Amino acid sequence: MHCTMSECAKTCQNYDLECMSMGLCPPGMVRHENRCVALERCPCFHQGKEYAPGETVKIGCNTCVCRDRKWNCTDHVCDATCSTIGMAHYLTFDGLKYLFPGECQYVLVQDYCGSNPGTFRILVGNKGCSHPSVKCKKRVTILVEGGEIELFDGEVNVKRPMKDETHFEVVESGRYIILLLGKALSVVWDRHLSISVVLKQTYQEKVCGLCGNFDGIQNNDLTSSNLQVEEDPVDFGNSWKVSSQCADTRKVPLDSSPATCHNNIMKQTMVDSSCRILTSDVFQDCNKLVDPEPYLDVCIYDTCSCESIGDCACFCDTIAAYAHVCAQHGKVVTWRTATLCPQSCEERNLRENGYECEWRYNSCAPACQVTCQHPEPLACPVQCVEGCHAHCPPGKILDELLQTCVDPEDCPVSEPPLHDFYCSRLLDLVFLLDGSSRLSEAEFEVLKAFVVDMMERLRISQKWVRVAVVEYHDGSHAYIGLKDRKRPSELRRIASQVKYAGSQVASTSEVLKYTLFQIFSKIDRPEASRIALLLMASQEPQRMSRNFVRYVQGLKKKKVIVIPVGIGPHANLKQIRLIEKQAPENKAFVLSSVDELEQQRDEIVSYLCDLAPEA
Amino acid sequence: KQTMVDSSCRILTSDVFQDCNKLVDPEPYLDVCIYDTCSCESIGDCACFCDTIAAYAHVCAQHGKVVTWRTATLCPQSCEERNLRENGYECEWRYNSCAPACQVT
Amino acid sequence: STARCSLFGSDFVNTFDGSMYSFAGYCSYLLAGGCQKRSFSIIGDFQNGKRVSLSVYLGEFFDIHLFVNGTVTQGDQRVSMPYASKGLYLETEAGYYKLSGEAYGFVARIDGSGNFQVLLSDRYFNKTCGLCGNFNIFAEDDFMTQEGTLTSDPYDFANSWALSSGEQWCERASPPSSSCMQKGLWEQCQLLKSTSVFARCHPLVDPEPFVALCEKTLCECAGGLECACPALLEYARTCAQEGMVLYGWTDHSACSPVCPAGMEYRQCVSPCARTCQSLHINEMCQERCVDGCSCPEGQLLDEGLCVESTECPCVHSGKRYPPGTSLSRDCNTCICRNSQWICSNEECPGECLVTGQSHFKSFDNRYFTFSGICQYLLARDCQDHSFSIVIETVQCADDRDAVCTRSVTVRLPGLHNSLVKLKHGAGVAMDGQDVQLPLLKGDLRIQHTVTASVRLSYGEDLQMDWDGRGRLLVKLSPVYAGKTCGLCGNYNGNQGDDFLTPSGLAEPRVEDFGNAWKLHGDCQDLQKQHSDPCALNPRMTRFSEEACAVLTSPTFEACHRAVSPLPYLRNCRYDVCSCSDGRECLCGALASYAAACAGRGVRVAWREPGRCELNCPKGQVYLQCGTPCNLTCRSLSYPDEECNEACLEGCFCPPGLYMDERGDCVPKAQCPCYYDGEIFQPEDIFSDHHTMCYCEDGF
Amino acid sequence: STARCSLFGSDFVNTFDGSMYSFAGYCSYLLAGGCQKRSFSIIGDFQNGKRVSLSVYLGEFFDIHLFVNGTVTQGDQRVSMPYASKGLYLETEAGYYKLSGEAYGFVARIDGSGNFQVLLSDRYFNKTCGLCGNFNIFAEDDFMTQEGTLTSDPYDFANSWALSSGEQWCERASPPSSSC
């Protein structure tokens, strides 16, 4: 080896970490600024710079305060912006950027999915390209509350009116059309390609489509319309096409550069070096807050695919999308130049008067100014947007019909009595539902009704009784968790709308494993009784039953009661007796058929509440 | 790409240039436009196409046919960089399709 | 509103303005198009008088050829329906081959019997010319020739609108010879006038031209009453165009328009016919209905076939699966019910990975590259301190971009604060003592894998696999979900927060995130994570591209569905460009992607003589899927130690031989016996105060 | 004004700042180039200790290979002199094969006996690294390795600046045996 060169101390950064295993200030004091500094006075770190205790940092709509080397942040769910970037790239609500070129019409956002009663549905159609091209454009159809607003050719087309036209509003500002479709839904459109949908927290967990289910989780955003998560965005998008007869995207091989750059060098590098504008000095301060790499990829892809001629719009619009994101994060960037993507507003200043120069381009101007058509101020998602902005003296107001500033006067215009039996006591309960084919869908429906009425007869809350519902169909499909804060009526609705799997096998040992290691992972209510209904209607292959006794004994060691409720001739009576042998309180119910649940319900709930203590 | 180049260079035949085409033949400039636009495949600045069209417009202006071919969506040009100022803004500079060449200063 | 042109029957045409005539073409002819400035051309192709295809040209840059028998060719290249390109949509709407040009303002169709159809938007009023004639309500002027003159002869007009090509030059077509009439057949043509259902349309469409056409086609007939059907069908379609759908004409007459197997012909079929795998968006379908074929009531379409609503399958990964089928996604399963999948919604084991020049995968599948040079906290249980894994990174080549893990360190506080160090070269030390493997010590187990990689296990809930060259794979059971911390993330099923830092906030930059987890303050804080090391060594860029492209080749297409190849492609190119030896790192990256595929249960035979063959020691044989449980003679000495491990690729002894310490393959009669940690040779005997033993067959 | 680097004789090198040493390479090595952001790379190719070509790369989109015996190949495709493309000019100036890069700020040359030459503009002062060393008048610091550390051994430095390819992976070069 030809080498030819040359307990532990703690630092505010590495205090909580291990000691370097590759080889002194007083206790309670820490190295900082090459001096010993007391604990509880170490600063907090963000974006590579330090913050003294008591200082604050602004993160989206949330605020964080530095206390004891830990940021302590507000927990507001900020408004989320889905965005179509370029001609073939999408950015979901949770931040997943993915590629999907398609010719057809697709669901961009929709709440008419799942059990939720829908209210709005936004469709996006690609016209003039699927492989990004110069002459391309996108059509948006906004089917909100029965009304319909179509966005096309850079103009709004209200093809049917809404039920509440007061909630509806359209604002034109800078390059963008801003539509308010409600108190919690808005759309921002650059009039050419970059559609953006903004949702407030009230729509969380409810929407779907190409923008994904807004839940703060990225991994599940490629959930197909048929509820299956896809590894490839092409299949996901194909699953979200509105018209079945239309063509599917073909999953072209994933070349390192698109067509017309795959075999065209000196175009690939021109595209690369021109898209590196995202890394230049003007954007260099935004790159600390936002990652330019996804937008760099979009820029390269669209610029290869487009090879535009007269309008350089593909490149310029991608850069403008990145600048729009930066402006949302407070980093307004002046990226336009006379030699790079120039924009002029002088067409609005030349006039029959000659020339009067109220309109300027501005890097970004306040989005929703007051006008003769919008005299009252109105809340709108984006604070500052790029484009032509009319600047005129105090007290003077813009008229959108004149595109001219004019005087303000010149404008042209719980529940106990649900049953006699009500169970107000400390209990944690799990319903394990056999999803095998040994129950037909009709039988599974009556089994669900049995669960639902039992939930009617329990005092559902984090106090008193907590309920969880788990279907097992060789995998443990949980529909309700004990941590869910939803109201009892909503929980009963969710239980009533549990779907039917109908698997040929439903591993019972596997659901015992699931409840043991994932449901009762931590006993957060040691004073409360913990009970599970292993209601079951099927055999399992012997090879899958080998760890059954281990799991039931582990559940006993956690003092989780398991009450097997065998149903029908195909119930695995052997596993039931094995459960009974573990503890006397694990007494079994064996039923002729699921309709006998209606008869057994009263004593089942009586037993469950006998096995639970009061406050 | 050949046909996009062709149809975009046909701007020389459009209405704004249609009166100049009586005085000047656009075919040579159409050929130059097509050639340069294929060869360039420009990215950020659309300068090859725009400069060829500007050369044809310059010839037209020499022949007295001043043509207003610029648009916000086609080869836009802005002069506002000269109007913004340390005092704020004053709008003395304007784009003009063509202005007298050798003004007094 | 919109015009309609039809070429129907054997040799008949109907213009936009209603002029109707016969033409038996022998070449291709212009049916419609922009007549001064021809932005598009609709071209009907004939052969021996019969129609064979309906072509469309968008102005010499795109051409499409829809043949009568379902075949579609773009240029001379065949393509499959449905097809969409450059504003043209080919679809099997209502069982009839559609070719929609909404942007260009036209819709074309071929029915099951070969009758062409063209609908042309109002924007082409008085601006089109072709066999369909001009489009101005005056019908007498439809026969304008391409020379710009009217003619009383249909054939002069049609031949004037012929179009030749480089493999077909048009001959002058002329009327064919004919014989001309039979009363019983003539009654069928008179149906147009006598029947009540057709009588509805008389105020809108005069039946007399159709009756004359029907009479002369009966003269041309070579069959039974069905010869009158083209005229009746065209009359009904003309009436539908004018506004009156003649719902009952198919029942009164003896005709039955051709439909594909199992589908019924019906008037006013909604274009938005219900396929199973279709969103229930009925508000979008504002279009008018059309005549065509439909599946019988209660059935649904599925890849063109009609199926029962309950019979029809789910779709995943481009494949269709019958109802009741189950698909696995790691530890989860998804059941096809109705058209949907019912999925298991449970947490599966998390796998963090360090696999090259500082390429990482968090427990939540966030891929990133960091390239920092320090000891970094890779993964730790910040909640209960069950374990703590630290990696030591060094520059692994001359390039600044080549940084890879040299050694791994694992603290196990529950095991009396044991400090295992996994070293370069796959050695192991414990509390500084170099140790000999396998090591069994309480819950801790360490042993060599068939790949010579050290595999560490601690209980059931933690496992590690260290190859000694720089690849580390850490597998946690769901017990640690949410409890984890470090570069590998918090293991909570979300990529979004994997750049969390001990400060409690998520760093938007990988550099700051990684610097936050460095253990030693004197280490350099990484300023920028430079991607694309190929810039520093341009010589390697061609090899990098052309070699790492194999990850997207059909060699791995079997896996692209299971695992996305893009992160592994990025990592491969980075490694090949930055490594000391590009061949070794090429093999490393390809093996990483193949290992991911195998983790998803897909095995790819990717090794070949030209790339990355395992040259197995001595007489051992390479297997792509071999079982490790019974390879070593220790397995003979400890047969009751349970082993259920899945197969893996590596070097194994032939089926009849076990493997000893030297790596030599030996019959079980020659294995030594391991007893109390001592190695006894075959046939060895010993007796003690308490016991008498002897070694035979490795036991 | 402008720097000069030379690789001359059998196995000798002269840096921009005057440091001079011997190296018998067996692979291709970086002679000069943008050292943080490498917009271009000048690469000297050796074989059995002797020089065989002077290659230039403009950042992975264009490469040119000027061999000692007059042959020029763009990529693997042979081309004939004079040649001009993408700002690079190959010319037989004064009987010696020139490779001018005025736009990029460098001029390269091979004389009739195989001695390489590189002239690098002032804009690369203190911003280049390679066998020609950095370009700052201090000559003692020319032996910076690609790892960013000085070394007293010319071979450590040179081998640190080796560049491998998909058909040639660099072996560790070492001083040859000699009599003196």
Ligand SMILES: *[C@@H]1O[C@H](CO)[C@@H](O)[C@H](O)[C@H]1NC(C)=O
């Ligand atoms: C964080 O802030 C909240 C709200 O002021 C406060 O209740 C809490 O004690 C603070 N500290 C922690 C560790 O949550």
Ligand SMILES: *[C@@H]1O[C@H](CO)[C@@H](O)[C@H](O)[C@H]1NC(C)=O
């Ligand atoms: C752009 O608008 C902001 C106000 O939001 C103003 O401060 C700035 O001066 C404006 N720039 C121009 C050029 O008008």
Ligand SMILES: *[C@@H]1O[C@H](CO)[C@@H](O)[C@H](O)[C@H]1NC(C)=O
């Ligand atoms: C351009 O200048 C001419 C005078 O040379 C004038 O007539 C014309 O109105 C000007 N155009 C604009 C847009 O200022």
Ligand SMILES: *[C@@H]1O[C@H](CO)[C@@H](O)[C@H](O)[C@H]1NC(C)=O
């Ligand atoms: C039409 O049918 C023939 C005979 O089966 C077949 O060979 C051909 O591919 C089909 N399509 C065309 C365009 O001929």
Ligand SMILES: *[C@@H]1O[C@H](CO)[C@@H](O)[C@H](O)[C@H]1NC(C)=O
């Ligand atoms: C149609 O076009 C012809 C030829 O240009 C013209 O004479 C006629 O007025 C136009 N309109 C109608 C209704 O024919």
Ligand SMILES: *[C@@H]1O[C@H](CO)[C@@H](O)[C@H](O)[C@H]1NC(C)=O
């Ligand atoms: C090991 O097990 C495999 C599979 O169970 C079997 O084929 C083989 O014969 C066994 N013995 C050896 C020495 O491989």
Ligand SMILES: *[C@@H]1O[C@H](CO)[C@@H](O)[C@H](O)[C@H]1NC(C)=O
């Ligand atoms: C150098 O000389 C050899 C021998 O004549 C010749 O084959 C070769 O083409 C020349 N050029 C190169 C690059 O080897």
Ligand SMILES: *[C@@H]1O[C@H](CO)[C@@H](O)[C@H](O)[C@H]1NC(C)=O
């Ligand atoms: C050259 O670069 C080094 C490293 O950035 C710097 O320390 C030095 O000041 C620069 N200038 C000179 C004259 O060395």
Ligand SMILES: [Ca+2]
């Ligand atoms: Ca989500």
Ligand SMILES: [Ca+2]
């Ligand atoms: Ca007419």
Ligand SMILES: [Ca+2]
């Ligand atoms: Ca996470």
Ligand SMILES: [Ca+2]
């Ligand atoms: Ca120097």
